[PDB]
RNA sequence: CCGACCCGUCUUGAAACACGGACCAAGGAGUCUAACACGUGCGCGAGUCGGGGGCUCGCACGAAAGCCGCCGUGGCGCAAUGAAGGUGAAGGCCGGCGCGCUCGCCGGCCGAGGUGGGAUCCCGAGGCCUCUCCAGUCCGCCGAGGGCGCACCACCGGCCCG
């Protein structure tokens, strides 16, 4: 019953947010699209042509073809039980560049660095990063203050 | 050898392995090629695109005879004669060059796919194409052709 | 050029720890001279 | 071959008899009579075999010879043992292991002599 | 109970021939043992050839095993496949060649045998070098079969170039309607 | 030439014989140390809270690197993420347990089956009950029991493991190679709890048995295996 | 003593107030042909197949079996593409020349290109040997790296037809 239409249910997700109609910022035409890096869908309202599909939205793929106005991205897809990488043409409105794609690569060129250095200096060093460890044994210094002891506080009905 | 097949080792089972809801009934869906644009149309166009319709000039009194024209390859050229032709060609002291008759062979047209030794040989056939032609003469050899 | 370049550079030259111990002998290969001579000591008994 | 003609008659054979879950061979010179390619009678090129005396007394210890392979007329040579047990006990052993005709049929051999000898002799009252 | 899905648990594969071809047992056999007693995993690989089913055991032609051996560093070794041996009449010239094979066709052989060449069963083989040491295992075209034209994505769907299933061939079979953009469709 | 082969073998034997007594002694060794290490750190504990309660501060203790999840619930009826998360901590079948290494990334994947698990924080004696009494080792995809030093020397040398008391020491303090020594156990098959359960459908702060008890945990064991 | 509703069937659900069944014996229902498709076994293999005909004391079997080869006519395969007229599948390297102009004329060789993987195979520094060594003799094993790379996969080139 629901309706097949390119943009159903996009009265929300492709509108602008508040206080931020009017002219699209410059800067995000001045951006550098190479192939092969990662880039995150939006799909502003204010440019019509070379919107996405609503299931592209939010979604983050990889750019293999750089055009005029427009890039193309291959985005993964999933289709009931089965992720197919679809290829699809976004204008550059409608994309941005994937943070976590660069915090990797400058994980990289420190942890070569890294590397370099601790071959000239011998001495070995951690580069795997590990997830948060139990926190090791510590004094809790008084300070001759007594710890503030509490009690519930008593029922009393105030609205 | 009904001893190996699937019925003998049905028996005991009431269905006979065609199950008990959609059961064995005659003819569910049509019979033969029934509904090819109705309702076996997804199986027709996903397995023989291209079924319905009409493409072409139709020709009546079509014979088969008239266009035959048999090919041969450059590559399979020189099985058309015996080794012997071969090593004598190959090794002869003058620029003698065996002829081979392919049409005697029962091969009326030489097509140019593969190539040829470098040696020279005369092809009598009805009908070359440019490149076996090409590569005919590249190796010194010459074409004839026959009716 | 850069093969030879780069190869010529790089040819261009100028306690006691008792379990320590134990783990020495105690390899196939490190550890052979050390328990033939401790079997040695065992066997034989000289003075002095 | 041995192991040739063993893949012909494995389990297609005149000598072959597959009853009560249990196989045996009734060739003539198959120890033990099972259907095992170690004691088939016919598919090697040396074997042995003990049988019976004619008379009810004594063994019979056939072997093959090397040379008439294709000659079965003349390619079993037998040999009648008519001594007391130990003694006969000891010729086939002898026969077997001090020749190196075929050692693996050694105690096969030593027991079927064994068990002939003692059919021979009459029974308890 | 215990939670494991048990629809995978029985693996398929040849553990055995299906022939019943004695000859074939019998090296089957021998190449058991070795690959048992061996540390080679050239038996490994020879013996599991050996089960497999003859469109898993393609011909090699005669051209391709000339092409595969005139390769740099194969000069004196010994070409193995397990299946059989092809004549190829579009070469002219045969080396000198060490071939082991489970079949050599006549010509082929005559062929080799006249070259000055040799062939082997898989038991001389196996008398020769007995951890295949020197040898280069080669193997025909496994999927040069008509079949495999017809295998693939479906042909009345886009991009595919399989083969359709048609009695006949010409232009009234299958070429009018999804195969031109003059009759609704071509995808 | 017999002799001299005979010489051979007797020199040969000898070699093997002492190499296996130099190995005996370095595990009897290295068991002694582990008891020294073992009883420093339980004074050390000790020690510490008594200076800090001597200087009227609190001591907090490191919270503990090591944990034993128990299985506690069926297979029936599990939602598919508890199911997946409780194939990967190895715990396929009820009363299963598993000693898994403690960090956010464990402690969230322990949250997400809190009903079905009870786990806690073993001490020593847990330790060396579970690994001596149901101690068997994945050896070659095959659960062999740890009948002899060999089975975890063949396996696990190459990490510096060599007997039960290494095992043991990688286990109970979470050592470099925690990771190989774990996965080379077996799930334990624990029996069921003697005495019974007091609930396992709610957890075990009100009254149940599932969730963490952090010490508890050894009673379970003790009446477990 | 404990447990225990009547089977078959349709059904989300049958012991059902759902239908068939009083009992017993015998009979009783995925077959054959044709045409495909895929898998497996066998023979030969760029070939293969005599199936129709013919030749062999005409016939117990034998209406079988054997053979034909200038009986391979013919079928399938070995070449595709176009509605059709028709056309119809080899490049790489080193060169001297125009003007080595994004190409035209020849030489010499090679003989279906290249990239990333790639079982297998090959070389292999260095190790393992004994009552010990300074001294090298023959072969075995482990072995870091390296090399040729089957089939097959992904990709980029190349060739034929419209
Ligand atoms: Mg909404
Ligand atoms: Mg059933
Ligand atoms: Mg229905
Ligand atoms: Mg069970
Ligand atoms: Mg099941
Ligand atoms: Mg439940
Ligand atoms: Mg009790
Ligand atoms: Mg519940
Ligand atoms: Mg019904
Ligand atoms: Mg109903
Ligand atoms: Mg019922
Ligand atoms: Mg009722
Ligand atoms: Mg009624
Ligand atoms: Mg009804
Ligand atoms: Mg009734
Ligand atoms: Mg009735
Ligand atoms: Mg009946
Ligand atoms: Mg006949
Ligand atoms: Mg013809
Ligand atoms: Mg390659
Ligand atoms: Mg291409």
């Given at each position: 019953?629901?309706?097949?239409?390119?943009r159903?249910?996009?009265?929300?997700m492709?509108?602008?947010?508040?206080?931020?109609?009017?002219?699209?910022?410059?800067?995000?035409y001045?951006?550098?699209?190479?192939?092969?890096?990662?880039?995150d869908?939006?799909?502003?309202?204010?440019?019509?042509?070379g919107?996405?599909h609503?299931?592209?939205?939010?979604?983050?793929?990889?750019v293999?073809?750089?055009?005029?106005?427009?890039?193309?991205?291959?985005?993964?897809?999933q289709?009931?039980?089965?992720?197919?990488?679809?290829?699809?043409?976004?204008?550059?409105?409608?994309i941005?560049?994937?943070?976590?794609?660069?915090?990797?690569?400058?994980?990289?060129?420190?942890?070569?660095?890294?590397?370099?250095?601790?071959?000239?200096?011998?001495?070995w060093?951690?580069?795997?990063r590990?997830?948060?460890?139990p926190?090791?044994?510590h004094?809790?210094?008084?300070?001759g203050?007594?710890?503030?002891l509490?009690?519930?506080?008593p029922?009393?009905?105030?609205? | 050898?009904?001893?190996?097949?699937?019925?003998?080792?049905?028996?005991?089972?009431?269905?006979?392995?065609?199950?008990?809801?959609?059961?064995?009934?005659?003819?569910p869906?049509?019979?033969?090629?029934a509904?090819?644009?109705?309702?076996?149309?997804?199986?027709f166009?996903?397995?023989h695109?291209?079924?319905?319709?009409?493409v072409?000039?139709k020709?009546?009194?079509?014979?088969?005879?008239?266009?035959?024209?048999?090919?041969?390859?450059?590559?399979?050229?020189?099985?058309?004669?015996?080794?012997?032709?071969?090593?004598?060609?190959?090794?002869?002291k003058?620029?003698?060059?065996?002829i081979?008759?392919?049409?005697?062979?029962?091969?009326?047209?030489?097509?140019?796919?593969?190539?040829?030794?470098?040696?020279?040989?005369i092809?009598?056939?009805?009908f070359?194409?440019?490149?076996?032609?090409?590569?005919?003469?590249?190796?010194?050899?010459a074409?004839?052709?026959?009716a | 050029?850069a093969?030879?370049?780069?190869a010529e550079?790089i040819?261009?030259l100028?306690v006691?720890?008792?379990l320590?111990?134990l783990a020495?002998?105690?390899?196939p290969?490190?550890?052979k001279?050390?328990?033939?001579?401790?079997?040695?000591?065992?066997r034989?008994?000289?003075?002095? | 071959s041995?192991?040739?003609?063993?893949?012909?008659?494995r389990?297609?054979?005149?000598?072959?008899?597959?009853?009560?879950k249990?196989?045996?061979?009734?060739?003539?010179?198959?120890?033990?009579?099972?259907?095992?390619?170690r004691?088939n009678?016919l598919?090697?090129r040396?074997?042995?075999?003990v049988?019976?005396?004619?008379?009810?007394?004594?063994?019979?210890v056939?072997?093959?010879?090397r040379?008439?392979?294709?000659?079965?007329?003349?390619?079993?040579?037998?040999?009648?043992?008519?001594k007391?047990?130990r003694?006969?006990?000891?010729?086939?052993?002898?026969?077997?292991?001090?020749?190196?005709?075929?050692?693996?049929?050694?105690?096969?051999?030593?027991?079927?002599?064994?068990?002939?000898?003692?059919?021979?002799?009459?029974?308890?009252? | 109970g215990?939670?494991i899905?048990?629809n995978?648990?029985?693996?398929?594969?040849?553990?055995?021939?299906?022939?019943?071809?004695?000859y074939?047992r019998?090296?089957?056999?021998?190449?058991?043992?070795?690959?048992?007693?061996?540390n080679?995993?050239?038996?490994?690989?020879?013996?599991?050839?050996?089960?497999?089913?003859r469109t898993?055991?393609?011909?090699?032609?005669?051209?391709?095993?000339?092409?595969?051996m005139?390769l740099?560093?194969?000069?004196?070794?010994?070409?193995?496949?397990?299946?059989?041996?092809?004549?190829?009449?579009?070469?002219?010239?045969?080396?000198?060649?060490?071939?082991?094979?489970?079949?050599?066709?006549?010509?082929?052989?005559?062929?080799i045998?006249?070259?000055?060449?040799?062939?082997?069963?898989?038991?001389?083989?196996?008398?020769?070098?007995?951890?295949?040491?020197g040898?280069?295992?080669?193997?025909?075209?496994?999927?040069?079969?008509?079949?495999?034209?017809?295998?693939?994505k479906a042909?009345?769907?886009?991009?595919?170039?399989?083969?359709?299933?048609?009695?006949?061939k010409?232009?009234?079979?299958?070429?009018?309607?999804?195969?031109?953009?003059?009759?609704?469709?071509?995808? | 030439?017999?002799?001299?082969?005979?010489?051979k073998?007797?020199?040969?034997?000898?070699?093997?014989?002492?190499?296996?007594?130099?190995?005996?002694?370095?595990?009897?060794?290295?068991?002694?140390?582990?008891?020294?290490?073992?009883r420093?750190?339980?004074?050390?504990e000790?020690?510490?809270?008594?200076?800090?309660?001597?200087?009227?501060?609190f001591?907090?203790?490191?919270?503990?690197?090591?944990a034993?999840?128990?299985?506690?619930?069926?297979?029936?009826?599990?939602?598919?993420?508890?199911?997946?998360?409780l194939?990967?901590?190895?715990?396929?079948?009820?009363?299963?347990?598993?000693?898994?290494?403690?960090?956010?990334?464990?402690?969230?994947?322990?949250?997400?089956?809190?009903?079905?698990?009870?786990?806690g924080?073993?001490?020593?004696?847990?330790?060396?009950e579970?690994?001596?009494?149901?101690?068997?080792?994945k050896?070659?995809?095959?659960?062999?029991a740890?009948?002899?030093?060999?089975?975890?020397?063949?396996?696990?040398?190459?990490?510096?493991?060599?007997?039960?008391?290494?095992?043991?020491?990688?286990?109970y303090?979470?050592?470099?190679?925690?990771?190989?020594?774990?996965?080379?156990?077996?799930?334990?098959?624990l029996?069921?709890?003697?005495?019974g359960?007091?609930?396992?459908?709610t957890?075990?702060?009100?009254?149940?048995?599932?969730?963490?008890?952090?010490?508890?945990?050894?009673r379970?064991?003790?009446?477990?295996?």
């Open positions: 019953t629901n309706t097949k239409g390119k159903r249910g996009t009265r929300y492709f509108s602008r947010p508040f206080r931020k109609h009017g002219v699209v910022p410059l800067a995000t001045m951006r550098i699209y190479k192939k092969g890096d990662i880039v869908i939006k799909g502003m309202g204010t440019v019509q042509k919107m996405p609503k299931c592209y939205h939010g979604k983050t793929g990889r293999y073809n750089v055009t005029q106005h427009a890039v193309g991205i291959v985005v993964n897809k289709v009931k039980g089965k992720i197919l990488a679809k290829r699809i043409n976004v204008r550059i409105e409608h941005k560049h994937s943070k976590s794609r660069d915090s990797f690569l400058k994980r990289v060129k420190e942890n070569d660095q890294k590397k370099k250095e601790a071959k000239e200096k011998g001495t060093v951690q580069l795997k590990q997830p948060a460890p926190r090791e044994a004094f809790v210094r008084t300070n203050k007594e710890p503030e509490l009690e519930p506080i029922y009393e009905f105030m609205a | 050898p009904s001893r190996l097949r699937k019925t003998r080792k049905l028996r005991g089972h009431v269905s006979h392995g065609h199950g008990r809801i959609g059961k064995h009934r005659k003819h869906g049509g019979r033969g090629n509904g090819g644009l109705h309702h076996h149309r997804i199986n166009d996903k397995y695109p291209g079924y319905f319709g009409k072409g000039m020709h009546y009194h079509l014979k088969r005879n008239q266009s035959f024209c048999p090919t041969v390859n450059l590559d399979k050229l020189w099985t058309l004669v015996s080794e012997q032709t071969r090593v004598n060609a190959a090794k002869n003058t620029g003698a060059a065996p081979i008759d392919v049409v005697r062979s029962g091969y009326y047209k030489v097509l140019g796919k593969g190539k040829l030794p470098k040696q020279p040989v092809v009598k056939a009805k070359f194409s440019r490149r076996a032609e090409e590569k005919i003469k590249s190796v010194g050899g074409c004839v052709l026959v | 050029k093969m030879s370049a780069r550079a040819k261009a100028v006691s720890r008792k320590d111990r020495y002998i105690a390899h290969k490190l550890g001279r050390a328990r033939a001579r401790i079997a040695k000591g065992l034989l008994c000289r003075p002095k | 041995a192991h040739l003609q063993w893949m012909v008659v389990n297609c054979s005149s000598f072959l008899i597959k009853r009560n249990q196989t045996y061979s009734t060739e003539p010179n198959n120890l033990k009579a099972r259907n095992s390619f004691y009678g598919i090697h040396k074997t042995v075999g049988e019976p005396a004619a008379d009810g007394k004594g063994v019979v056939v072997i093959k010879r040379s008439g392979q294709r000659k079965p007329a003349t390619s079993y040579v037998r040999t009648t043992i008519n007391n047990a003694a006969t006990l000891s010729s086939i052993r002898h026969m077997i292991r001090k020749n190196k005709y075929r050692p693996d049929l050694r105690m096969a051999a030593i027991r079927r002599a064994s068990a002939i000898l003692r059919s021979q002799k009459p029974v308890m009252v | 215990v939670d899905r048990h995978k648990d029985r693996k398929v594969r040849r553990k055995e021939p299906k022939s019943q071809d004695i074939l019998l090296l089957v056999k021998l190449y058991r043992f070795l690959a048992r007693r061996t080679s995993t050239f038996n490994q690989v020879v013996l599991k050839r050996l089960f497999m089913s898993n055991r393609p011909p090699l032609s005669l051209s391709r095993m000339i092409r595969k005139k740099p560093g194969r000069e004196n070794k010994t070409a193995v496949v397990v299946g059989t041996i092809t004549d190829d009449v579009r070469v002219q010239e045969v080396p000198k060649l060490k071939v082991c094979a489970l079949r050599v066709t006549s010509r082929a052989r005559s062929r045998l006249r070259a000055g060449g040799k062939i082997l069963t898989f038991d001389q083989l196996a008398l020769d070098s007995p951890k295949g040491c040898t280069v295992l080669l193997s025909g075209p496994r999927k040069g079969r008509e079949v495999y034209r017809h295998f693939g042909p009345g769907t886009p991009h595919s170039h399989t083969k359709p299933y048609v009695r006949s010409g232009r009234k079979f299958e070429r009018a309607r999804g195969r031109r953009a003059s009759r609704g469709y071509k995808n | 030439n017999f002799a001299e082969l005979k010489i073998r007797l020199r040969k034997k000898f070699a093997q014989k002492m190499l296996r007594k130099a190995r005996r002694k370095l595990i009897y060794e290295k068991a002694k140390h582990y008891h020294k290490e073992y420093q750190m339980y004074r050390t000790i020690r510490m809270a008594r200076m800090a309660r001597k200087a009227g501060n001591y907090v203790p490191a919270e503990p690197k090591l034993f999840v128990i299985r506690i619930r069926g297979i029936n009826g599990v939602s598919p993420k508890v199911r997946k998360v194939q990967l901590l190895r715990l396929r079948q009820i009363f299963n347990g598993t000693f898994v290494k403690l960090n956010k990334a464990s402690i969230n994947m322990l949250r997400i089956v809190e009903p079905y698990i009870a786990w924080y073993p001490n020593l004696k847990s330790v060396n579970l690994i001596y009494k149901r101690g068997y080792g050896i070659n995809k095959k659960r062999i740890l009948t002899d030093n060999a089975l975890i020397a063949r396996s696990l040398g190459k990490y510096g493991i060599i007997c039960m008391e290494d095992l043991i020491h990688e286990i303090t979470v050592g470099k190679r925690f990771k190989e020594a774990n996965n080379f156990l077996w799930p334990f098959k029996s069921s709890p003697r005495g359960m007091k609930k396992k459908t957890h075990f702060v009100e009254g149940g048995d599932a969730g963490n008890r952090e010490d508890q945990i050894n379970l064991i003790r009446r477990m295996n």
